[PDB]
Enzyme design. Structure first.
Site, mmCIF file in Angstrom:
data_model
loop_
_atom_site.group_PDB
_atom_site.id
_atom_site.type_symbol
_atom_site.label_atom_id
_atom_site.label_comp_id
_atom_site.label_asym_id
_atom_site.label_seq_id
_atom_site.Cartn_x
_atom_site.Cartn_y
_atom_site.Cartn_z
ATOM 1 N N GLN A 84 0.788 -1.234 0.000
ATOM 2 C CA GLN A 84 0.000 0.000 0.000
ATOM 3 C C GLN A 84 0.818 1.281 0.000
ATOM 4 O O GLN A 84 0.306 2.355 -0.334
ATOM 5 C CB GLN A 84 -0.980 0.002 1.185
ATOM 6 C CG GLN A 84 -0.358 0.346 2.525
ATOM 7 C CD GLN A 84 -1.315 0.085 3.695
ATOM 8 O OE1 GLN A 84 -1.968 -0.955 3.757
ATOM 9 N NE2 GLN A 84 -1.396 1.029 4.620
ATOM 10 N N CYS B 207 -5.296 0.332 3.706
ATOM 11 C CA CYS B 207 -5.433 -1.032 4.206
ATOM 12 C C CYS B 207 -6.882 -1.503 4.083
ATOM 13 O O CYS B 207 -7.124 -2.635 3.697
ATOM 14 C CB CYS B 207 -4.980 -1.136 5.672
ATOM 15 S SG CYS B 207 -5.995 -0.111 6.785
ATOM 16 N N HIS C 85 -6.137 -1.237 11.983
ATOM 17 C CA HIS C 85 -5.605 -1.739 10.724
ATOM 18 C C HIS C 85 -6.446 -2.816 10.043
ATOM 19 O O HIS C 85 -6.685 -3.874 10.613
ATOM 20 C CB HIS C 85 -4.171 -2.249 10.992
ATOM 21 C CG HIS C 85 -3.362 -2.480 9.763
ATOM 22 N ND1 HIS C 85 -3.097 -1.482 8.842
ATOM 23 C CD2 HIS C 85 -2.776 -3.603 9.272
ATOM 24 C CE1 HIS C 85 -2.388 -1.985 7.844
ATOM 25 N NE2 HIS C 85 -2.182 -3.262 8.078
ATOM 26 N N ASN D 272 -1.533 -9.205 5.054
ATOM 27 C CA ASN D 272 -1.370 -7.759 5.245
ATOM 28 C C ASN D 272 -1.185 -7.112 3.860
ATOM 29 O O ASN D 272 -1.187 -7.799 2.829
ATOM 30 C CB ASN D 272 -0.145 -7.485 6.139
ATOM 31 C CG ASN D 272 -0.126 -6.066 6.716
ATOM 32 O OD1 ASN D 272 -1.077 -5.297 6.567
ATOM 33 N ND2 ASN D 272 0.980 -5.719 7.381
HETATM 34 C C1 LIG Z 1 -5.284 5.719 10.718
HETATM 35 N N1 LIG Z 1 -4.690 4.881 9.628
HETATM 36 C C2 LIG Z 1 -5.602 4.923 8.443
HETATM 37 C C3 LIG Z 1 -5.338 3.822 7.430
HETATM 38 C C4 LIG Z 1 -5.219 2.428 8.047
HETATM 39 C C5 LIG Z 1 -4.894 1.420 6.943
HETATM 40 N N2 LIG Z 1 -3.874 1.568 6.112
HETATM 41 N N3 LIG Z 1 -6.449 2.107 8.807
HETATM 42 C C6 LIG Z 1 -7.692 2.272 8.346
HETATM 43 O O1 LIG Z 1 -7.944 2.661 7.214
HETATM 44 C C7 LIG Z 1 -8.833 1.940 9.315
HETATM 45 C C8 LIG Z 1 -9.436 0.576 8.970
HETATM 46 C C9 LIG Z 1 -10.683 0.235 9.794
HETATM 47 C C10 LIG Z 1 -11.196 -1.162 9.443
HETATM 48 C C11 LIG Z 1 -12.454 -1.540 10.215
HETATM 49 C C12 LIG Z 1 -12.218 -1.463 11.741
HETATM 50 C C13 LIG Z 1 -11.584 -0.109 12.172
HETATM 51 C C14 LIG Z 1 -10.360 0.247 11.289
HETATM 52 N N4 LIG Z 1 -9.851 3.005 9.242
HETATM 53 C C15 LIG Z 1 -9.535 4.241 9.637
HETATM 54 O O2 LIG Z 1 -8.415 4.476 10.100
HETATM 55 N N5 LIG Z 1 -10.501 5.208 9.521
HETATM 56 C C16 LIG Z 1 -10.161 6.608 9.804
HETATM 57 C C17 LIG Z 1 -10.856 7.587 8.868
HETATM 58 O O3 LIG Z 1 -12.249 7.321 8.832
HETATM 59 C C18 LIG Z 1 -12.518 6.027 8.296
HETATM 60 C C19 LIG Z 1 -11.898 4.930 9.176
HETATM 61 C C20 LIG Z 1 -4.064 2.508 9.039
HETATM 62 C C21 LIG Z 1 -4.367 3.513 10.167
#
Ligand SMILES: CN1CCC(C#N)(NC(=O)[C@H](CC2CCCCC2)NC(=O)N2CCOCC2)CC1
Length: 217
Positions: free
Chosen positions: A19, A25, A164, A184
């Protein structure tokens, strides 16, 4: 249920993706889950476009492209959109771009998705065995996660505060330790050729069974 499962052995898992500096992710998790279903339905293994999700499953889906998103809402976007393009037709650029979806390049559709009950590892096992790879969120912020190389990952400092999005493509037991086989999206250099075996049946370790979901075609 089978004592162990590995969807890679069924040709249902595409190559591990990288990524880069884009927080996509969630998009890779979502496409990985759909890729297995696509293979199961058509017999063909095809990488789906994570970029398509990053650029198109946006505000309306509560997603923020390279700044994070949700696998469930990504699934709904594919349902609402009536399709998602192949990775080859809509390549990953690790950047937020204007939506460029074109149905001429559609490689999969989604009819619905299911969210598993919170923290139930037995239900998650059943889904991985009977339905296919499952998108999940894990707490991957601890230094040990980045440095994982082998064995079964167990981190006492882990929490159920997940950040993540990854993909469970199997489960099993290694030297007396039950684990979840996780794909991953940090490329093949990470962990075991892009995978990490995370502790299973250890009190929902790192929140792996906190928010599981899988799409269907
Ligand atoms: C904060 N940063 C953003 C990118 C990331 C991936 N790559 N994580 C995400 O995208 C995570 C994945 C999500 C999957 C379902 C359970 C909760 C987590 N989501 C996430 O960080 N957000 C923040 C913005 O609003 C949408 C959700 C890594 C951490």
């Amino acid at each position: 249920l089978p004592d162990s499962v590995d969807w890679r052995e069924k040709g249902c898992v595409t190559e591990v993706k990288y990524q880069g500096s884009c927080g996509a992710c969630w998009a890779f998790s979502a496409v990985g889950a759909l890729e297995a279903q696509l293979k199961l339905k058509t017999g063909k293994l095809v990488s789906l476009s994570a970029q398509n999700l990053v650029d198109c499953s946006t505000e309306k889906y509560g997603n923020k492209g390279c700044n994070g998103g949700f696998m469930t809402t990504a699934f709904q976007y594919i349902i609402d959109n009536k399709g998602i393009d192949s990775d080859a037709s809509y390549p990953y650029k690790a950047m937020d771009q204007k939506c460029q979806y074109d149905s001429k390049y559609r490689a999969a559709t989604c009819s619905k998705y299911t969210e598993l009950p919170y923290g139930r590892e037995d239900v998650l096992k059943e889904a991985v065995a009977n339905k296919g790879p499952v998108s999940v969120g894990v707490d991957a912020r601890h230094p040990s996660f980045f440095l994982y190389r082998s064995g079964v990952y167990y981190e006492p400092s882990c929490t159920q505060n997940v950040n993540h999005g990854v993909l469970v493509v199997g489960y099993g037991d290694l030297n007396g330790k039950e684990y979840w086989l996780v794909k991953n999206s940090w490329g093949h250099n990470f962990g075991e050729e892009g995978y990490i075996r995370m502790a299973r049946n250890k009190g929902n370790h790192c929140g792996i069974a906190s928010f599981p979901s899988y799409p269907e075609i």
